[PDB]
Amino acid sequence: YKAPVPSGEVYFADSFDRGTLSGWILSKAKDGKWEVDEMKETKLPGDKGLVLMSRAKHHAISAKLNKPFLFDTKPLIVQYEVNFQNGIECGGAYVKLLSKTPELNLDQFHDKTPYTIMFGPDKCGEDYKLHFIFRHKNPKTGVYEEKHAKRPDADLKTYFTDKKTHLYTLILNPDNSFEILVDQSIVNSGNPVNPSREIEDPEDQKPEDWDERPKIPDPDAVKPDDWNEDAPAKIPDEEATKPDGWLDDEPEYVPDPDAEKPEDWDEDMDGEWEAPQIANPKCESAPGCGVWQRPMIDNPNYKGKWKPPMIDNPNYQGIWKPRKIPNPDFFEDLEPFKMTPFSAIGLELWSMTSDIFFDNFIVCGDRRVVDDWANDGWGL
Ligand SMILES: [Ca+2]
């Protein structure tokens, strides 16, 4: 079967139902490429999606929205689906909402291209992350400070290994609060962080007389006389004896009969050749070779080193700290949701394995209009 058609407005939605990555722009900045076929071993004869396919760096692809999404009297809703068909070792398959600007040379989709929000799955080695970041404009320095969003309560792993297509929803209400419904289940929610507070005088110094040492050695207890601290942990076994067929003259190891410093070697500093030692064979059929070593047994009188007991330090003036002195770059927490608008949705992804499946890219402001395209697309 198949169907999924827009309900209300658009902002951006793409189902690749047409069948082509018609309408997407490979970067040119500076690799891997993309295609739009069915799912590997599908189960839906018709739903093909934009799919990564390499190991190089799909650092590319993006597309212009249908209309600049501004952050005012409508919340933001973005949602797509991915599915690491070959499971991800270490890579990312999150979306990037390219900010608005006069001429947005997409084709030049650089890496430090300004975006407004980043969002989606990423997991390297064994971290399993589902991001959501929204760069805030330092309303003073004017610096673009990317404010993250705490992890979710729920392990994610499964979503990256069950080689089965999952869905990601992102909703940011002007409230300045959110949640990250993934496969319908809101796995995360909320409402560094934009405004600040103070700072400490980096010109303050932990004085030397300031003791931050909880416990200390009881200056009373003293190393006992029997505690000979110079006694080794090992002393020879005078009970032992040197086997008889032992070869005192036969040299432990011998220089290998392949001793040839490659005519590619530069003693001048490729080091200073030395023929690897082999292993004098004469010894193979012998008790031992070269200088004998009377085996060591443990040592009865070994002790260690004076272990004076620890005791609280009557003067441990708690761990010292800089004397908090005012906030110059002190800014403010407006209605954050009023972040710079974006005009494109792109994907600069590192990755590792191929066959990553992307699809149903949809971006609307209404929740229903989005909840439908969902049960329409993914729901199928
Ligand atoms: Ca599709």
UniProtKB/Swiss-Prot annotation:
Residues 190-268 are annotated as: Disordered. Residues 201-267, 271-328 are annotated as: 4 X approximate repeats. The modification N6-acetyllysine is found at K67. GO terms for molecular function: calcium ion binding; carbohydrate binding; unfolded protein binding. It is a single-pass type I membrane protein. Residues 199-332 are annotated as: P domain (Extended arm). Phosphorylation by MAPK3/ERK1 increases its association with ribosomes. Keywords: Acetylation, Calcium, Chaperone, Disulfide bond, Endoplasmic reticulum, Lectin, Lipoprotein, Membrane, Metal-binding, Mitochondrion, Palmitate, Phosphoprotein, Repeat, Signal, Transmembrane, Transmembrane helix, Ubl conjugation. Residues 246-268 have a biased composition (Acidic residues). An alpha-D-glucoside binds at Y94, K96, Y115, D122, E348. Disulfide bonds join C90-C124, C283-C289. GO terms for biological process: clathrin-dependent endocytosis; ERAD pathway; protein folding; synaptic vesicle endocytosis. Residues 204-242 have a biased composition (Basic and acidic residues). It is found in: Endoplasmic reticulum membrane; Mitochondrion membrane; Melanosome membrane. It comes from the Eukaryota. Ca(2+) binds at S15, D47, D359. Residues 249-282 are annotated as: Interaction with PPIB. GO terms for cellular component: endoplasmic reticulum; endoplasmic reticulum membrane; melanosome membrane; mitochondrial membrane; presynapse. Residues 1-380 are lumenal. Sequence repeats lie at residues 201-212, 218-229, 237-248, 256-267, 271-281, 290-300, 304-314, 318-328. Belongs to the calreticulin family. Calcium-binding protein that interacts with newly synthesized monoglucosylated glycoproteins in the endoplasmic reticulum. It may act in assisting protein assembly and/or in the retention within the ER of unassembled protein subunits. It seems to play a major role in the quality control apparatus of the ER by the retention of incorrectly folded proteins. Associated with partial T-cell antigen receptor complexes that escape the ER of immature thymocytes, it may function as a signaling complex regulating thymocyte maturation. Interacts with MAPK3/ERK1. Interacts with KCNH2. Associates with ribosomes. Interacts with SGIP1; involved in negative regulation of endocytosis. The palmitoylated form interacts with the ribosome-translocon complex component SSR1, promoting efficient folding of glycoproteins. Interacts with SERPINA2P/SERPINA2 and with the S and Z variants of SERPINA1. Interacts with PPIB. Interacts with ZNRF4. Interacts with SMIM22. Interacts with TMX2. Interacts with TMEM35A/NACHO and CHRNA7. Interacts with reticulophagy regulators RETREG2 and RETREG3. This is Calnexin. The lineage of its organism: Eukaryota, Metazoa, Chordata, Craniata, Vertebrata. The gene is CANX. The chain holds residues 61 to 458 of 593 of the full protein.
